């Protein structure tokens, strides 16, 4: 219906730059600094490997059949040739994992031979890790005194080599494998070698890593399904061993020719061949278990640091499973939780079966009719299932390490990358998870992929990564990944939201990084950006990119001048979005750093002038930036600006005005910035300069993913309003009940100067003559809160208003100097933040808020009515009043957006339509005393008629301005000294106050509905400023307050 004029949908100052309780983020504060935990630079190398082999052949030791070793029958060859080949084979077997390392072998050695082997290996790989593989099958079991067994020259005795001496021969960076019976014995010994302490864990200190085959009591298998070399064949030949075990156990074995497993086609590298694809699934499977099973710290040490240790610990998880079947429990030193029968070996078993069937027909002919396994598709689908259902901090996704393996193959690259970004989007915790898995380098390498299929996903991934960890700068530049996004800025690939991301990603690459500045500068990133300057988030970020690109790097500063960046940036200082303007001020501010004119002076003058224009901006966000850019400028021109401060106490006298203006800004964070600028000049080494905040706040947009109860309490208030609009109009309003429903003591010494009844709750807001604010409840008889609107010495209250009444009210507090301060949560006992504060009028200020249009009209003893659009936080218009005397009163019509009424000092009255080219509609005298228009307002209704024109003379003149100039109706409320007027919003009712203690209420036709007489509490005889009268906006309640100390509420029974 028509009553949607009464019920405006505009909401204002409820954006992210105005944020509340647990974030002072909004601006002023610096950005939230992080401290990363995924940082181990030492990609360790195992440089030397020492294979020892104690197997006396046809000579069982006295602790006693399977006897295959390194997949060789040692009884097929004769003992010495047997042992040569096993020596070689087992080298080759390891060699495949770390082929860039030296392998030395020792066959049935002396303790001296093992000494030198170990001593030389330590001397070879100085800091690099040394691997000691030991095989004691043909010698006795390790002892409780901690002893390996070896030989003497003649092979007549078994000699015990004590573990202590090994540990002295090799040192810190080393890893041992023990394929023998009773292997724990060796680890229990190792643990006892050093003095306990030196860690905050189970029991460690050094970098000694240990892998043992079985427990203390246990003995390696004898069954012929296994070899003697089980643990080593798991650890070192995992695929071959994993399948041979699969045959002999699961499918019962005799159907499948087990010797096909030796002859599996292709190589371990080609993921397109059946062997390599099986090898790839195994790596993926194993790595995945380790990730889910372990913690961050241990996983990264074993599974990510050393290519060999990674492989040995991956392949160890297979030993965990195979050895378990043969009465053996293997243990590593970094102990690791139980791995066998994880829900993922199931996936391996399935992939192995599907492989092993196919192997039968692929031998019949090399058809290469090799169907890739579904495994990689299936798992990525399980990652999608996670991303919808349970998609929280409800334990990690498990498939994450498999998504990383997929990035290594074009086969599912796109859908992996897609699903990765989907995962990265849900917050920094997910980025932390991705980067823990080791996503960084593969996603970084992909920044050389020309495939435009990818790029829109890659920018989105790199946006999210850089949103968390700023520090990736260094890598991105070092591989030339900066070029990738500069292309994407210039690319014909549409969508400016994607380009803001591209501009942001570059902003971060550049941010305090001269290697990145220069490398982007060469790549024409100034030119790319300035080409686009000819959507708001994109504009915001084009400026922040450029701002960072010049900053303290004067080669770029020059390149920007001769590319006319001032000429292209400055037009953004007028844009409706504060976020753009503040970013534009940042860019121009960072372009900085007698009678002389060189190129730069022309620029640096033209800059500062265009910034000084924006000193009086309606957004703190902007003013904060202007004050910082002025501080920068001020640093370099102390000399001049001090001489400017001498004569005040060409362009330098402009600056000093603006400093002292900033110093007395309403928003105290802007104020304390202006006071900083003043101290840089010496009014009361770079480190003293305040620092821009706009970059830091904007970046928080990306670190954040890219409702119904909102509308619930919205419709609550609308229903109540519509119902109580009708009830105000259509009720036959009776006489005033002189019995008040309070006479509340404010404790204001001089008394109450203005008040404001709340629509949807039982609240009064009052105001002292020095702008203290109380929030008195009338239904509870209780205070809700107190205040001091601004600590400045010159006080004076002008206006109280509500803003966004229909969803969480914000209290506007206009000061008599034209300062306007808006408060959130004023109703709460202590918590109440200044949302925004600017200075309208640039005296006796008068102000009015028109929620319909979002306009704040303001004026006073000035030639002009100044208009503010609070959606933009911008001074939209200066209307000349055309009076040559002061605006005493100012009412904006709630129904008709743009239209404005104004009462004047000489008794005159004026309409304006502020949206018209000529804004003054008409100008009428009404009442004829030449005293000032104390109060006025539009008649409660849906027309441009007016109650208006209570003059201090005493007459309240009604008038309709569609028809005639003179007065519709006159009422003589008071013989002189009309101190206040209250007109209702919907109910046909008004009231007026006198300086003769007196209040009067009239029907809209003008019947004495009731008189009231505020009496004095002592004989001051100064109830001469009955200053506040104000109705409820949906009921017939009357609040009233004087030059005494009481705020009394009445009603109409």
């Amino acid at each position: 219906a028509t009553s949607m004029a009464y019920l405006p949908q505009t909401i204002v100052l409820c954006e992210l730059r105005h944020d509340a309780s647990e974030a002072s983020a909004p601006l002023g504060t610096s950005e939230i600094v992080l401290v990363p935990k995924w940082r181990l630079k030492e990609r360790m190398k195992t440089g030397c490997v020492a294979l020892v082999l104690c197997l006396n052949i046809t000579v069982d030791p006295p602790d006693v059949c399977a006897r295959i070793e390194a997949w060789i029958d040692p009884f097929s060859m004769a003992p010495p040739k047997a042992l040569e080949t096993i020596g070689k084979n087992l080298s080759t077997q390891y060699e495949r994992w770390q082929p860039r390392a030296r392998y030395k072998v020792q066959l049935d050695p002396t303790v001296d031979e093992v000494r030198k082997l170990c001593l030389t290996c330590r001397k070879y790989a100085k800091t690099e890790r040394v691997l000691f593989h030991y095989n004691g099958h043909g010698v006795p079991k390790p002892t409780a005194n901690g002893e390996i067994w070896v030989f003497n020259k003649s092979y007549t005795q078994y000699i015990p080599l004590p573990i202590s001496e090994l540990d002295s021969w090799l040192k810190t960076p080393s890893i041992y494998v023990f394929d023998c019976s009773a292997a724990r014995m060796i680890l229990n010994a190792f643990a006892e070698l050093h003095d306990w302490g030196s860690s905050g864990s189970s029991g460690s200190s050094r970098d000694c890593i240990l892998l043992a085959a079985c427990d203390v009591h246990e003995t390696l298998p004898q069954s012929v399904e296994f070899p003697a070399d089980v643990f080593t064949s798991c650890l070192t030949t995992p695929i071959k061993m994993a399948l041979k075990w699969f045959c002999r156990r699961s499918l019962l074995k005799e159907i499948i020719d087990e010797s096909l497993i030796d002859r599996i086609p292709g190589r371990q590298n080609d993921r397109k061949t059946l062997l390599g694809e099986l090898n790839w699934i195994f790596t993926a499977v194993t790595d995945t278990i380790a990730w889910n099973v372990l913690p961050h710290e241990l996983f990264q040490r074993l599974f990510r640091q050393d290519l060999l240790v990674a492989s040995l610990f991956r392949n160890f998880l297979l030993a965990e499973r195979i050895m378990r079947s043969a009465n053996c429990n293997p243990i590593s030193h970094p102990m690791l939780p139980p791995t066998h029968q994880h829900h993922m070996w199931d996936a391996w078993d399935m992939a192995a079966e599907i492989c092993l069937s196919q192997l039968p027909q692929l031998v019949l002919d090399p058809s290469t009719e090799f169907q890739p396994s579904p495994f990689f598709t299936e798992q990525l689908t399980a990652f999608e299932v996670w991303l919808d259902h349970g998609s929280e901090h409800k334990k990690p996704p498990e498939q994450l390490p498999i998504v990383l393996q997929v990035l290594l193959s074009q086969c599912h690259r796109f859908r992996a990358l897609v699903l990765l970004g989907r995962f990265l989007d849900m917050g920094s915790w997910a980025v932390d998870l991705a980067l823990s898995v080791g996503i960084f380098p593969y996603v970084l390498k992909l920044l050389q992929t020309t495939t435009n299929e990818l790029r829109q996903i890659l920018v989105f991934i790199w946006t999210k990564i850089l949103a968390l960890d700023k520090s990736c700068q260094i890598d991105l530049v070092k591989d030339g990944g900066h070029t990738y996004f500069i292309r994407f800025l210039d690319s014909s690939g549409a969508f400016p939201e994607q380009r803001a991301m591209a501009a942001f990603v570059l902003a971060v690459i550049v941010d305090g990084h001269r290697r990145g500045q220069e490398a982007c500068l060469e790549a024409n990133l100034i030119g790319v950006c300035l080409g686009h300057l000819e959507e708001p988030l994109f504009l915001q970020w084009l400026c922040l990119c450029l701002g960072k690109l010049w900053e303290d790097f004067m080669e770029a500063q020059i390149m920007g001048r001769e590319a006319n960046a001032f000429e292209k940036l400055a037009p953004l200082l007028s844009e409706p979005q504060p976020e753009v303007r503040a970013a534009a001020v940042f860019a121009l501010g960072t372009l900085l750093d007698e009678f002389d004119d060189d190129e730069k002076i022309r620029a640096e003058d033209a800059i500062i002038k265009s910034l000084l224009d924006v000193v009086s901006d309606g957004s703190p966000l902007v003013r904060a930036e202007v004050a910082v850019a002025l501080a920068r400028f001020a640093f370099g021109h102390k000399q001049h600006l001090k001489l400017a401060a001498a004569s005040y106490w060409a362009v330098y006298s402009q600056c000093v005005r603006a400093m002292f203006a900033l110093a007395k800004d309403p928003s105290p964070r802007i104020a304390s910035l202006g006071r900083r600028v003043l101290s840089i000049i010496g009014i009361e080494e770079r480190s003293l300069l305040p620092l821009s905040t706009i970059y830091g706040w904007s970046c928080g947009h990306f670190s954040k993913p890219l409702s119904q109860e909102i509308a619930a309490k919205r419709e609550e208030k609308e229903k109540f309003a519509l119902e109580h609009i009708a009830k105000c109009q259509h009720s036959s309003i009776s006489k005033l009940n002189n019995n008040p429903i309070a006479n509340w003591d404010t404790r204001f010494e001089t008394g109450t100067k203005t008040a404001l009844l709340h629509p949807f709750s039982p609240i009064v807001v009052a105001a002292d003559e020095n702008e203290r604010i109380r929030v008195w409840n009338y239904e509870e008889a209780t205070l809700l809160n107190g205040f001091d609107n601004h600590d400045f010495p010159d006080k004076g209250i002008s206006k109280l208003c509500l803003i966004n009444e229909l969803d969480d009210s914000l209290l506007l507090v206009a000061s008599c100097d034209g300062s306007v301060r808006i408060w959130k949560n004023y109703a709460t006992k202590g918590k109440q933040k200044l949302v925004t504060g600017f200075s309208s009028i640039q005296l006796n200020a008068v102000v009015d808020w028109q929620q319909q249009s979002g306009y704040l009209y303001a004026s006073g003893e000035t030639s002009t009515v100044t208009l503010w659009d609070l959606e933009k936080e911008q001074l939209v218009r200066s209307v000349p009043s055309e009076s040559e005397c002061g605006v005493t009163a100012l009412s904006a019509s709630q129904v008709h957006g743009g239209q404005l009424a104004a009462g004047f000092a000489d008794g005159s009255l004026r309409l304006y339509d502020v949206r018209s080219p000529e804004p003054l509609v008409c100008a009428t005298r009404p009442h004829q005393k030449v005293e000032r228009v104390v109060g006025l307002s539009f008649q409660p209704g849906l027309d441009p008629a007016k109650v208006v024109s209570a003059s201090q003379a005493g007459d309240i003149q009604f008038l309709d301005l569609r028809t005639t100039r003179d007065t519709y109706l006159t009422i003589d409320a008071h013989r002189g000294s009309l101190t206040a007027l209250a007109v209702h919003r919907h109910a046909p009712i008004i009231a007026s106050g006198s300086a003769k203690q007196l209040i009067k209420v009239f029907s809209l036709q003008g019947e004495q509905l009731g008189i009231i007489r505020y009496y004095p509490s002592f004989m001051a005889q100064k109830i001469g400023s009955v200053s506040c009268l104000t109705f409820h906006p949906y009921q017939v309640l009357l609040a009233a307050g004087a030059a005494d100390s009481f705020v009394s509420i009445y009603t109409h029974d």
Binding site: A310, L408, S409, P441, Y442, K445
Partner: peptide, 8 residues
């Protein structure tokens, strides 16, 4: 930045 190979 390594450990697992990528095809290029």
């Amino acid at each position: 930045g390594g450990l697992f190979v990528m095809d290029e």
